[PDB]
């Protein structure tokens, strides 16, 4: 058995037509989750971003 | 009995007012207020989703 402890941060997760949570992705993690975040999108265009 | 000092515990069913379909009503479930009419759907919820 596994323990794990929990903090506050912000995540952002997929539903679906059906209703139930498909995929999710954190938003502190790395760089390219951090822009994922921001542009509120899965996928980003080759780029230079804010 | 008491009022204002605990979450609610005990208390009896209140008698409610028959749905009525396709007209102007001043809707309020169990704790929504707004207004709107209302109609049979299709959306599939979730067993726990309200």
Same mark, same amino acid.
């Given at each position: 058995? &596994?323990?794990? &402890?929990?903090? !506050?941060?912000? /995540?952002?997760?997929? &539903? *679906?037509? *059906?209703?139930?949570? $498909? ?7 790395? !760089?390219? @989750?951090? $822009? +994922?975040? $921001?542009? +509120? @999108? /899965? $996928?980003?265009? +080759?780029?230079? &971003?804010? | =009995?008491?009022?204002?000092?605990? #979450?609610?515990?005990?208390?009896? #069913? ?11 009503? %001043? =809707?309020?479930? %169990? ?10 759907? %299709?959306?599939?919820?979730? #067993?726990?989703?309200?």
């Amino acid at each position: 058995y &596994y323990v794990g &402890y929990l903090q !506050p941060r912000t /995540f952002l997760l997929k &539903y *679906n037509e *059906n209703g139930t949570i $498909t995929d999710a992705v954190d938003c502190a993690l790395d !760089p390219l @989750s951090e $822009t +994922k975040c $921001t542009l +509120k @999108s /899965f $996928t980003v265009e +080759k780029g230079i &971003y804010q | =009995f008491e009022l204002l000092h605990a #979450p609610a515990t005990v208390c009896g #069913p209140k008698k409610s007012t028959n749905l009525v379909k396709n007209k102007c009503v %001043n =809707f309020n479930f %169990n704790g929504l207020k707004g207004t709107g009419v209302l109609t049979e759907s %299709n959306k599939k919820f979730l #067993p726990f989703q309200q």
